[PDB]
Symmetry: C2
Amino acid sequence: AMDPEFMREFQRAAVRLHILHHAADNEVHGAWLTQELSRHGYRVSPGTLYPTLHRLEADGLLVSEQRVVDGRARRVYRATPAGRAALTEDRRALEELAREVL
Amino acid sequence: AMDPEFMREFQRAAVRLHILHHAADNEVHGAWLTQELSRHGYRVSPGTLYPTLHRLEADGLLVSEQRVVDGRARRVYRATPAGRAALTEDRRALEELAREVL
Ligand SMILES: [Cl-]
Ligand SMILES: [Cl-]
């Protein structure tokens, strides 16, 4: 990367936005998010992703539920009403920058 | 803002992108960048801007020159060839995120 500082900041923002995008659409597990973000070309690990999930919930933008399904306890995340509003604002900001410089 | 953490990260990235965009197009003084970024709705001060200019130059993406014009010494910044290449990569990253989530 010619500009690793841009890429680092932008990637943090991108990851956050992708998480909200996916969690608004359906319930998601962290394990699946790691794979889906990776598919899209974002370098993430459970070690980096789970703390961002937890922070998103602390921010009120996700809510999680522990479920026991098929004998295994797992945590699923979904967007809250505040998270859907955030998703709209975050996307708007992205759309504006894209319109301005491209 | 519903998501201040997204807005903080995204704005740092946006400002960096704008700086390269302006410095590729012309030579710039810091004082003018402050005004131009402010016009566009970015909250920037000399305290935030000058350190990012310095880091951009350290990264080889900008070069600055102290220049005496009309009897007054000022520092001007412009993009280097590496900075122009970075601008292209940063734009590509923006384009990709726009495709993914919009
Ligand atoms: Cl760096
Ligand atoms: Cl978890």
